[PDB]
Design a protein around this ligand. Structure first.
Ligand SMILES: Nc1cccc(C(=O)N[C@@H](C(=O)NO)c2ccc(-n3cccn3)cc2)c1
Ligand SMILES: [Mg+2]
Ligand SMILES: [Zn+2]
Length: 888
């Protein structure tokens, strides 16, 4: 069944009130539900059809009378159909009692058990796995929810809204009633039951001075890992107050960590539920990455609230409207909190590798897709991250003042209602008119960012007239046709630009954002005293392929002297890409022609000099430094190479790294040593609320350099690796494991770091990732060992992802020409699909580039996908995904 965006129609029914009784027992959960319903104006005499998946019916009723199966209703484990003649024509009550089984719900959607916690996950279509409903986001209702359970096992009971009663029940049971008066969609329903321990605090809002109770919950074992999350939550509330002027609406906010979770987290009006790996940390038991991760995920779920309780999605095709906007808000927050340029760079790095790959793949879709089969497959980097860049472009175009005005308009015009992407665009259009002082100005073209798939390519030509002091930038845009649009239209592309004086490194013009609205345009600047070097797409101002057409000499100058972090980073990226493409072709030619000898173009010496210059600048940023000594991601590179031979790419990278290392290793070593004091400072190691993003960037730089030195077998570096393994910081001692791969000390550090990791669930998952990603010739044997000794038959998605996904980035080994790596991951996907289709689809990620590889590896991957597609028991999720991915 395929759902089309253009087919939207309001329900012929209304659900005004939901009254739930959820009774949790050892081997079953009984759910009783009364829905106070009505008939809408759009009703035309149709059957009453409820969603309900996997429910065991004890009984159903209309107005307290039992309905009879076959005669009055049918149920096929997916839809409950009540024939219209038995459906009332005014306000009526529908009631049901069903049985569900969270203890065996390993798909982690609906109501399920995670270790000793019962928790729900209803977005997007999970509420129908709990009870019957018209499970769509535009069905708004009031909720009154009662939960009962064994008191010893489940002392803490949580749901949306206010707890209004707590009571004892015979047999050592207890119950709690929660009433949530404001209307909400059912995907925001949540319930939690467990032996939860917590940290708490009180927050006083900025403008109304009201006290908000903040609680963060986990199992008792890890309660000491809750402090950073609580800090992050306070930080999020402060930010939305300061930047957007928005206060929290309710009197309490709960965050709950659970061990088994399909994604990162979920917002549920006051009851936010998190993957433990995105909420829990301690300096002793977490790598540095956890700290930015918790900050962004807690922020993200928090920024969902204000907008979520005023404007609900009309339908799921508007997903990017809530998610792209919330990621944009999350990124603004994260940039302001970390105060490091690597934060924005890391978002760009992710978009241009993972999301660009997706957008040039058979899975390519606009941020507002035209159809879906399985909602779970729609939560993509395109909808989220390209969505966020589209939301961010409004800010670039409008500036802060008018952006913040269009944002307010969108709320006002749409408060209390459902909205669409057009509603948001209309609101910004009003801000655009006010900014341009022109009520004929419009953003109608901007709507193509929602409807048009594929990554635009933007290219440049320049002209300078020295006598006229006149500089011209000629710009061209193009999007490649694909399966979604035969003809692509030009987009509204904002191009933030500067002009750098090559003679002194100074800005030559004020902040300027070119508005490209045609297929091509020419932008002319007068009174330009000398030929500039253009600094293009500052801040990465549009989600596009940038073809800067600059020389490497110009790129080096930008890298050294430009003011914009992204353009410096991109200029470096572009120098590397030119080099990678050149050496790749030279290696490829030698392979194809079976050459006994051949030449390779060396790495630009002035480029190596510039890297040295930056590394040696004490005033330059450590995180930025770690980027400039790293080649572009493999998934970024592949967008530029047809029929990519992964072996040839691996030889290419090897050559380039060795060229630069042969010149700079002594520099790397010196810096690795000199950075130690500040990077590994222990002054605040036992203060869980003290987080220093610069210091963590220094550790990133040290660990990056150590990797480079280890690969290069720098004299006596093993000494440094061994000492590194003794560091209190897990980022350090896990790095010592992965860099020791090049030495016969590896399995000793394997055992040491395992013993350090095994008693913390999340830390062990980081250990697994480190092992999985290790550059080992015997990695296949090592993975087998992990399966047998550690992973076993765990159904925890964190465990499974930890063991397998990092390995799939091993360019040389995962892409083994035998196809053994493809075969291995396909076996894991098919195995996982039996109990968790959402996670099975996640494990398909390496296959997304299948049609970009050399013809042999294309065939190998295709064979595995077709094998998976032929499994009789294949889930709808996995089938849809592989059908789309293989163009069937
Ligand atoms: N940065 C980052 C990376 C990875 C995942 C997430 C993440 O957890 N995103 C969630 C979100 O938006 N929460 O509000 C989220 C919520 C629900 C789904 N979902 C998929 C299918 C059904 N539901 C997916 C993601 C964030
Ligand atoms: Mg069932
Ligand atoms: Zn979200």
């Amino acid at each position: 069944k395929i759902h089309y965006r253009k087919d939207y129609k309001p329900s012929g029914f209304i659900i005004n009130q939901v009254t739930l009784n959820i009774n949790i027992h050892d081997q079953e959960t009984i759910v009783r539900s009364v829905l106070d319903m009505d008939i809408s104006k759009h009703n035309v005499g149709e059957d009453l059809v409820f969603d309900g998946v996997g429910l065991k019916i004890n009984e159903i009723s209309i107005n307290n009378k039992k309905l009879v199966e076959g005669e009055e209703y049918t149920y096929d484990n997916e839809f409950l159909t009540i024939f219209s003649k038995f459906v009332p024509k005014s306000k009526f009550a529908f009631s049901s009692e069903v049985i569900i089984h969270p203890e065996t719900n390993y798909a982690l959607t609906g109501l399920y058990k995670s270790k000793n916690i019962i928790v729900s996950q209803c977005e997007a279509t999970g509420f129908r796995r709990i009870t019957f409903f018209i499970d769509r986001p535009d069905m708004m209702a009031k909720y009154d929810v009662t939960v009962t359970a064994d008191k010893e096992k489940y002392p803490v009971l949580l749901s949306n809204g206010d707890k209004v009663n707590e009571f004892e029940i015979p047999g050592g049971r207890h119950g709690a009633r929660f009433n949530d008066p404001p209307l909400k969609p059912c995907y925001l329903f949540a319930v939690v039951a467990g032996d939860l321990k917590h940290l708490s605090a009180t927050y006083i809002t900025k403008y109304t001075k009201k006290k908000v109770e903040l609680y963060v919950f986990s199992e008792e074992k890890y309660v000491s890992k809750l402090q950073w999350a609580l800090e992050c939550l306070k930080k999020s509330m402060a930010f939305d107050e300061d930047y957007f002027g928005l206060e929290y609406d309710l009197s309490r906010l709960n965050l709950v960590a659970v061990s088994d979770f399909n994604v990162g987290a979920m917002e549920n009006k006051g009851l936010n539920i998190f993957n433990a790996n995105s909420l829990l940390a301690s300096k002793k038991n977490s790598i540095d990455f956890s700290y930015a991760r918790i900050l962004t995920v807690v922020g993200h779920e928090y920024f969902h609230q204000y907008t979520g309780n005023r404007v609900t999605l009309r339908d799921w095709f508007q997903l990017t409207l809530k998610e792209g906007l919330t990621v944009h808000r999350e990124n603004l927050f994260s940039e302001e909190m970390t105060k490091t340029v690597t934060t924005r760079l890391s978002h760009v790095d992710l978009l241009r590798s993972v999301q660009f790959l997706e957008d040039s793949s058979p899975l390519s879709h606009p941020i507002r897709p035209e159809s879906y089969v399985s909602m779970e497959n729609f939560y993509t980097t395109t909808v989220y991250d390209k969505g966020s860049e589209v939301m961010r472009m409004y800010l670039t175009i409008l500036g802060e003042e008018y952006y913040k005005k269009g944002f307010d308009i969108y709320i006002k015009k749409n408060d209390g209602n459902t909205a669409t992407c057009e509603d948001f665009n209309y609101a910004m259009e009003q801000a655009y008119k006010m900014k341009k002082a022109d009520n004929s100005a419009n953003l109608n073209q901007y709507l193509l960012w929602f409807s048009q798939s594929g990554t635009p390519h933007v290219s440049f030509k320049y002209n300078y007239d020295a006598e006229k002091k006149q500089y011209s930038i000629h710009v061209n845009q193009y999007t490649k046709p694909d399966e979604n649009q035969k003809e692509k239209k030009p987009l509204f592309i904002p191009i933030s630009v500067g002009l750098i004086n090559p003679e002194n490194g100074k800005e030559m013009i004020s902040q300027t954002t070119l508005e490209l609205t045609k297929e091509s345009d020419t932008f002319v600047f007068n009174n330009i005293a000398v030929k500039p070097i253009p600094s293009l797409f500052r801040g990465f101002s549009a989600p596009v392929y940038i073809e800067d057409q600059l020389t490497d000499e110009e790129r080096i100058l930008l890298l050294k002297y430009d003011s914009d972090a992204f353009v410096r980073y991109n200029s470096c990226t572009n120098i590397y890409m030119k080099q990678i493409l050149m050496n790749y072709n030279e290696f490829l030619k030698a392979k194809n022609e079976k050459l006994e000898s051949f030449q390779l173009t060396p790495v630009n010496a002035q480029f190596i000099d510039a890297i040295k210059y930056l590394l040696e600048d004490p005033h330059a940023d450590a995180g930025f430094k770690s980027y400039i000594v790293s080649l572009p991601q493999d998934r970024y590179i592949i967008n530029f190479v047809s029929n990519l031979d992964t072996d040839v790419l691996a030889d290419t990278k090897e050559y380039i790294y060795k060229q630069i290392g042969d010149k700079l290793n002594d520099v790397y070593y010196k810096m690795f040593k000199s950075l130690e004091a500040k990077a590994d400072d222990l002054t605040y190691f036992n203060d869980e609320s003290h987080v220093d993003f610069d210091q963590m960037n220094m550790r990133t730089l040290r660990n990056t350099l150590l990797s480079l030195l280890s690969k290069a077998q720098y004299p006596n570096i093993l000494n440094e690796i061994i000492e590194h393994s003794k560091s209190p910081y897990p980022s350090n001692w896990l790095t010592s494991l992965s860099v020791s791969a090049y030495f016969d000390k590896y399995f000793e550090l394997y055992d040491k770091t395992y013993k350090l990791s095994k008693d913390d669930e999340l830390l062990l998952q980081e250990w697994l990732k480190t092992v999985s990603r290790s550059d080992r010739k015997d990695i296949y044997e090592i993975l087998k060992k992990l399966e047998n000794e550690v992973l076993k038959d765990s159904k925890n998605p964190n465990d499974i992802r930890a063991v397998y996904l990092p390995f799939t980035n091993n360019l040389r080994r995962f892409h083994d020409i035998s196809g053994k790596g493809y075969k291995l991951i396909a076996e894991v996907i098919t195995k996982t699909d039996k109990f968790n289709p959402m996670v099975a689809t996640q494990l398909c990620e390496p296959f997304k580039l299948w049609n970009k590889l050399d013809t042999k590896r294309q065939e190998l991957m295709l064979n595995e996908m077709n094998t998976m597609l032929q499994e009789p028991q294949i889930s709808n999720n996995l089938k849809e995904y592989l059908l789309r991915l293989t163009n069937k």
